[PDB]
């Protein structure tokens, strides 16, 4: 839904998207055999599959594929500075496959643009989209355009005729942050079988131990999880599944 879904916006108006708790697993994805780039700054996905962030955010936009490199912490250029700047601490990964496939618009793909002529240098995570006629010189711009003055947005005209370097790649900016409250998505959670009547180790929703698991005739309230005894020892588990 927030990944492989339709078109987007121009990177100069690069969009944002918030992600919830829903467990997740990068590694379910990571090996999706589509990520032309998974340049992954924070940690390897095969490692952060269980990494829990109070916040995870997705950005996505249509740009000339090349800009991928500019989407490395420590980059410059009219786009890496005038259309978006990642931070040099982007705990995240640069997901992207390609736009030219679904973005060619053989007669010149428009729909996406870029404030080529922006004033400020992009602060990391700046979502700013304020268009303006900056002073290419000192002719007081205030609208003036035609000499020493122009507006910021220019044409990201992608064609199939022009080469992949001048063809667009679909580009995603991943970014996640874990504060201090109860965090959201918490990687994976494996599942063995209910091996019973024999001495085994067990991990029942974090309750670890060793013993022999049999069937009980006990029953307790639908909200309790495990039962203890007089001496404060676990002797009953409600199979989390």
């Amino acid at each position: 839904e927030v990944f492989n879904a339709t078109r987007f916006a121009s990177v100069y108006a690069w969009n944002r998207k918030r992600i919830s708790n829903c467990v997740a697993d990068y590694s379910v994805l990571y090996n999706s055999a589509s990520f032309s780039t998974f340049k992954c700054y924070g940690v390897s996905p095969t490692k952060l599959n269980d990494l829990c962030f109070t916040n995870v955010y997705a950005d996505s936009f249509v740009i000339r594929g090349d800009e991928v490199r500019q989407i490395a912490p420590g980059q410059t250029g009219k786009i890496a500075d005038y259309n978006y700047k990642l931070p040099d601490d982007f705990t995240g990964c640069v997901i992207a496959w390609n736009s030219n496939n679904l973005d060619s618009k053989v007669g010149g793909n428009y729909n996406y643009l870029y404030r080529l002529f922006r004033k400020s240098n992009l602060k990391p995570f700046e979502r700013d989209i304020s268009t303006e006629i900056y002073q290419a010189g000192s002719t007081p711009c205030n609208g003036v355009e035609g000499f020493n003055c122009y507006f910021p947005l220019q044409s990201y005209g992608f064609q199939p005729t022009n080469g992949v370097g001048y063809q667009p790649y679909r580009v995603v900016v991943l970014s996640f942050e874990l504060l201090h409250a109860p965090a959201t998505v918490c990687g994976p959670k494996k599942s063995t079988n209910l091996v019973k009547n024999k001495c085994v180790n067990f991990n029942f929703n974090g309750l670890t131990g060793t013993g022999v698991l049999t069937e009980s005739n006990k029953k307790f309230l639908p909200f309790q999880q495990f039962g203890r005894d007089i001496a404060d020892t676990t002797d009953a588990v409600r199979d989390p599944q």
Epitope: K78, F117, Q135, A136, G137, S138, T139, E145, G146, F147, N148, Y150, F151, Q154
Partner: antibody, heavy 121, light 106 residues
């Protein structure tokens, strides 16, 4: 490499029109505000022409003259056709690759000589 | 407005702190370029926009100069530094150079 074939000028009686096919050589030139300049023989070069990739096909405000600039986006080179020459045009014409402050008028062609004289040497 | 340079014909020897003045009256230090023409060659992009020296052209041309009297300071005159300099006012309809500031190697 990045070059501008100043071409199309020639010997001229200072009353008719002329041309400058300052052909963009080695240029993916559909992104720049290509300007032009004019050097009186034995002097410095004063900016005259200024096409704009965004649009704005215009000139020196002091020389807002009949001489007309355009970029043949097909061939992707700036035109600056020297229409209806007068005496005050007597100089040499060039063209250049400019951006204002991102960059400035950077890439220059060799030279385009307007022989604005009837006489031949 | 017209700028003008100091040593119009600066007959300096190589290895000298060659430095060209550029006094204005409209004070467009928000630009003020500086190019060296070789005769028989259209001069290109030496210096421009405040002082940002486009490279390949050595750092010896220590750019400086603000207000109205600007001043590029060549560190050392050198055997390749025999040419004509052009401090370029811009930012208005006056995108003009110097009055052909010549520096003569000696």
């Amino acid at each position: 490499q990045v070059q501008l074939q100043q071409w199309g000028a020639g010997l001229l009686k200072p009353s008719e029109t002329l041309s400058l096919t300052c052909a963009v050589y080695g240029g993916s030139f559909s992104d720049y505000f290509w300007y032009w300049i004019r050097q009186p023989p034995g002097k410095g070069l004063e900016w005259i022409g200024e096409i704009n990739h965004s649009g704005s096909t215009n000139y020196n405000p002091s020389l807002k003259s009949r001489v007309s600039i355009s970029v043949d986006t097909s061939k992707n080179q700036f035109s600056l056709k020297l229409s209806s020459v007068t005496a005050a045009d007597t100089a040499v014409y060039y063209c250049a690759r400019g951006q204002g402050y991102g960059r400035v008028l950077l890439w220059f062609g060799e030279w385009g000589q307007g022989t604005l004289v009837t006489v031949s040497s | 407005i017209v700028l003008t340079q100091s040593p119009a014909t600066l007959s300096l020897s190589p290895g000298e702190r060659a430095t060209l003045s550029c006094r204005a009256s409209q004070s467009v230090s928000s630009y003020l370029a500086w190019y060296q023409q070789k005769p028989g060659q259209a001069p290109r992009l030496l210096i421009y926009d405040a002082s940002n020296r486009a490279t390949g052209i050595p750092a010896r041309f220590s750019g400086s100069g603000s207000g109205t009297d600007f001043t590029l300071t060549i560190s050392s005159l050198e055997p390749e530094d025999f040419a004509v300099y052009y401090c370029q006012q811009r930012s208005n309809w006056i995108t003009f150079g110097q009055g052909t500031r010549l520096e003569i190697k000696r």
